[PDB]
From a paper:
EPZ033294 is an inhibitor of SMYD2 that was optimized from an initial hit from Epizyme’s proprietary histone methyltransferase-biased library using a radiometric assay with tritiated SAM and an H3 peptide as substrates. EPZ033294 inhibits the enzymatic activity of SMYD2 with a potency of 3.9 nM and is noncompetitive with respect to peptide substrate and either noncompetitive or uncompetitive with respect to SAM. Instead, SAM dependence was tested by measuring IC50 values at two SAM concentrations differing by 10-fold; the resulting IC50 values were similar, inconsistent with a competitive mechanism. The binding mode suggested by enzyme kinetics is consistent with the crystal structure of the ternary SAM-SMYD2- EPZ033294 complex. The cyclopropyl triazole moiety occupies the lysine channel with the amide carboxyl group hydrogen-bonding to the backbone amide NH of Thr185 and the azetidine nitrogen interacting with the side chain of Glu187; both amino acids are also engaged in hydrogen bonding interactions with peptide substrates. Compared to all other published SMYD2 inhibitors, EPZ033294 binds in a distinct and unique manner, traversing the peptide binding site and inducing a pocket into which the hydrophobic tail of the molecule is inserted. (A) Two molecules of EPZ033294 (molecule 1 = cyan; molecule 2 = purple) were seen in the peptide binding site of SMYD2 (green). SAM (yellow) is show in stick representation. The dissociation constant (KD) was determined to be 5 nM, with a kon = 5 x 105 M-1s-1 and koff = 0.003 s-1. Western blot analysis of intracellular levels of BTF3me1 as a function of EPZ033294 concentration demonstrated a concentration-dependent inhibition of this mark with an IC50 of 2.9 nM.
Within the protein lysine methyltransferase (PKMT) family of enzymes, one branch contains five enzymes that share two highly conserved, functional domains: the catalytic SET domain and the MYND domain; these five enzymes are known as SMYD1, SMYD2, SMYD3, SMYD4 and SMYD5. Among the SMYD enzymes, SMYD2 and SMYD3 have been implicated as targets for a variety of cancer indications. In the current study we exemplify pharmacophore series for SMYD2 and SMYD3 that show low nanomolar potency against their targets and significant selectivity over all other enzymes tested with favorable physicochemical properties and pharmacological tractability. S2 Table Crystallographic data collection and refinement statistics for SMYD2 and SMYD3 crystal structures.
Residue numbers in the entry: -5 to 432
The structure:
């Protein structure tokens, strides 16, 4: 049977497009799907490898490897072999000669980069692609009438950078069209991360962007090279709408919704946002002899929201040693009122694990991830990729310090989850099983 189901997935069989009352257009099933089933795949309509990963990944197929070959002309684009080089040429052409001309003045933002490739795919290929079997880039929603003279000013920067760096092999539409398009990208664009959650690049998957949002989703989006796959994490029955999450589901219901309104212009009405069952445990209060009063909680919460924004902006400025102090002390304050499973505590613990890893303090980074994992399993849903990568980190750290048994446990915990989300076939599942076997 295995042959037929790959074909069905590739063609989006057993699914359809419809109008979701109160959510524009959307996607629903016309057959049952069990937990771990592949629904559909969607090859990338446009993509770009992030600048800081050149030399580690091939630009065309995203394979991670050593001994890639360098572009003879510009020396700033790498490939598996000559086949991958030829296939990337229609796109790489947009930057090759310019990178040589501008030297080190060449710094277009990743948003500009990806939009240039969209424009170039439209001259070459005006008609409907295999990425667009149910929704087309042309049809993408913009939220143009909801924007303001902060946002609209930000786009006009990108429009200028596009004209400045790309005029040579693109001809541009009128300003009105470019503003709409840059808004469409924001509403429909995807990021790609690796198994440790480092940024790799950006891309457009049109069929994938038909699906609407829920904080208790029933599918999950994973990557295989530049290809997107979609697998179920709850049982789905005929006539039922198919939902992803668009955001990190760790945080409480207020925090989630500020983000959704800001980036996507809507308010979620799902069961977790209605009942708010998990909010109380995400903001778990210390149980002291004289237990903390109500105003003393509103204090530590607003302090915590701000020490996250301070740290966000401090990543571009400061020393590693100074950032690790900012985490230590911010935890040290919060621990009087908040328990160790409070998500605002867990936030700073994660950032501190990041700082310890760049410093190669592997024992120091290990007891952060030890305190993280059990709370992460409680707050997140079943089959969460966030939970899976943290196990993965623990597995690797344990084995770096020669403690085989606890490392093998943590690696199998990660594989258990990945089987459901990435499928049993996945290249990652092999790569981890070779860490086991040595
Ligand atoms: O950009 C979006 N999502 C990106 C967040 N990325 C999460 C992700 C996936 N795989 N991995 C890598 C990964 C691989 C192996 C493990 Cl064990 C762990 C991790 C990260 C996907 C997005 C865009 N929208 C548009 C529709 C509004 N919604 N979400
Ligand atoms: O929900 C969170 N992140 C989600 C937003 N991320 C995906 C994303 C990004 N951009 N775009 C739109 C976009 C993508 C590519 C280009 Cl070229 C253009 C546009 C999607 C994932 C989140 C992050 N945190 C941090 C505090 C820990 N908390 N929640
Ligand atoms: C990537 S799109 C999804 C496709 C969209 N329905 C369309 O066809 O234009 C994101 C947009 O869909 C809408 N949307 C997604 N999930 C929603 C929800 N749970 N409630 C209301 N609107 C939602 C929002 O308007 C959001 O900006
Ligand atoms: Zn390649
Ligand atoms: Zn080149
Ligand atoms: Zn919700």
């Amino acid at each position: 049977k295995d042959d037929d189901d790959k074909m069905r997935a590739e063609g989006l069989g057993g699914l359809e497009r419809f109008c979701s009352p109160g959510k524009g257009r959307g996607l629903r099933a016309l057959q049952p799907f069990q937990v771990g089933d592949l629904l559909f795949s969607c090859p990338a309509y446009a993509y770009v490898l992030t600048v800081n990963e050149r030399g580690n990944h091939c630009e065309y197929c995203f394979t991670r490897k050593e001994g890639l070959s360098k572009c003879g002309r510009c020396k700033q684009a790498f490939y598996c072999n000559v086949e991958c080089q030829k296939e990337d040429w229609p796109m790489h052409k947009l930057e090759c000669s310019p990178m040589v001309v501008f030297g080190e003045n060449w710094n277009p933002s990743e948003t500009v980069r990806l939009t240039a490739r969209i424009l170039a795919k439209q001259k070459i290929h005006p008609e409907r692609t295999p990425s667009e079997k149910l929704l087309a880039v042309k049809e993408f929603e913009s939220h143009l009438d909801k924007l303001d003279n902060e946002k609209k000013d930000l786009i006009q920067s990108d429009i200028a950078a596009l004209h400045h760096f790309y005029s040579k092999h693109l001809g541009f539409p009128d300003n009105d069209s470019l503003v709409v398009l840059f808004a469409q990208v924001n509403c429909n664009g995807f990021t790609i991360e690796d198994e440790e959650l480092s940024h790799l690049g950006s891309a457009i998957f049109p069929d994938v962007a038909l699906m609407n949002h829920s904080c208790c989703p029933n599918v999950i989006v994973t990557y295989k090279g530049t290809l997107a796959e979609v697998r179920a994490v709850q049982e789905i029955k005929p006539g039922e709408e198919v939902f992803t999450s668009y955001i990190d589901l760790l945080y409480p219901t207020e925090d989630r919704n500020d983000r959704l309104r800001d980036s996507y212009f809507f308010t979620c009405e799902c069961q977790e946002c209605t009942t708010k069952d998990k909010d109380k445990a995400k903001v778990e209060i210390r149980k002291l002899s004289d237990p903390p009063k109500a105003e003393a909680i509103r204090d530590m919460v607003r302090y915590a929201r701000n020490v996250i924004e301070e740290f966000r902006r401090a990543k571009h400025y400061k020393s590693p040693s100074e950032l690790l102090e900012i985490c230590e002390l911010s935890q040290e304050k919060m621990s009087s009122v908040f328990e160790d499973s409070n998500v605002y505590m867990l936030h700073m613990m994660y950032q501190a694990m990041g700082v310890c890893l760049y410093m190669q303090d592997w024992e120091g980074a290990l007891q952060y991830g030890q305190k993280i994992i059990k709370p992460y399993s409680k707050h997140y849903p079943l089959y969460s990729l966030n939970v899976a990568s943290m196990w993965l980190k623990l597995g690797r750290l344990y084995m770096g310090l020669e403690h085989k048994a606890a490392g093998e446990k943590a690696l199998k915990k990660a594989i258990a989850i990945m089987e459901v989300a990435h499928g049993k076939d996945h290249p990652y599942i092999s790569e981890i099983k070779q860490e086991i076997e040595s």
